C-alpha cells in the first residue's frame, strides 16, 4: 500500500521511509506486536530497523542489476496485520 | 431471576424478569428477606 522512492546509487543506512509514521502504527508497541519483515517479500537492497520502524538502504542500489520496482511486506501479531511497500528507483 | 437487588422506597410496585423451563411457574420470590409464592401458566416459545 505504501509508495516510496529512492535515488540512484544511494548508500547503506540512508533514509528511505518511515513505515510506522505513515501507517499510523504505534512505534513503542512494535516489539510487543512483533513488527517484522515478511519472509516472502524480502529484498537484498533494503532493510528496516525493527525498533524505529524505519526502512533504509542495506546494499547500494544498482539500477541496471535490479531491472521495474521493489516490493517488501511487513507482518504484525496480536492483532494480525500485513502491509505492503513498493519502492521506485530512479535512473 | 434476571436481577439480584432492587431499590425499594415504600408501598410501591416493582418488576423483575425471569427464565424458566416449565410450562407452570409455581415458585418463590424472596422479596427482601421474606418469601412469597407465585403462580403462572407459561406458553411454549415461538422461536425453535
Amino acid at each position: 500500500q505504501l509508495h516510496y522512492t529512492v535515488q540512484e546509487e544511494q548508500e547503506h543506512g540512508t533514509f528511505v521511509g518511515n513505515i510506522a509514521e505513515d501507517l499510523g502504527l504505534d512505534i513503542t508497541k512494535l516489539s510487543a506486536r512483533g513488527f517484522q519483515t515478511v519472509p516472502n517479500s524480502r529484498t537484498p537492497y533494503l532493510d528496516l530497523n525493527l525498533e524505529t520502524g524505519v526502512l533504509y538502504v542495506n546494499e547500494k542500489i544498482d539500477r541496471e542489476q535490479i531491472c521495474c520496482v521493489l516490493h517488501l511486506e511487513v507482518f504484525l501479531e496480536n492483532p494480525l496485520e500485513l502491509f505492503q511497500v513498493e519502492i521506485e528507483v530512479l535512473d | 431471576l434476571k436481577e439480584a437487588t432492587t431499590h425499594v422506597t415504600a408501598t410501591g410496585s416493582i418488576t423483575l424478569h425471569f427464565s424458566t423451563s416449565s410450562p407452570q411457574a409455581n415458585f418463590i420470590v424472596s422479596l427482601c428477606g421474606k418469601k412469597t409464592t407465585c403462580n403462572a401458566e407459561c406458553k411454549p416459545p415461538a422461536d425453535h
Partner: protein, 51 residues
C-alpha cells in the same frame, strides 16, 4: 565440513478466504444451512454435550 541449508521454514501470516455466510432456517430441533461455495470449503458440526 558442514554447510548451512538455507531458506529456513519460518512462521509468518497469510490470508485465507472467508466463505459466504450461510442462510440458517430454523425448524423444531434442527437447523438447515443453505451454503454457497465456488471452491470446496470445510463444514464441521458438533453437538455441545456428552456425545
Amino acid at each position: 565440513g558442514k554447510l548451512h541449508i538455507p531458506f529456513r521454514l519460518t512462521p509468518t501470516v497469510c490470508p485465507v478466504p472467508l466463505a459466504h455466510t450461510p442462510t440458517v432456517t430454523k425448524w423444531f430441533k434442527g437447523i438447515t444451512l443453505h451454503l454457497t461455495a465456488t471452491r470446496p470449503t470445510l463444514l464441521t458440526t458438533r453437538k455441545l454435550g456428552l456425545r
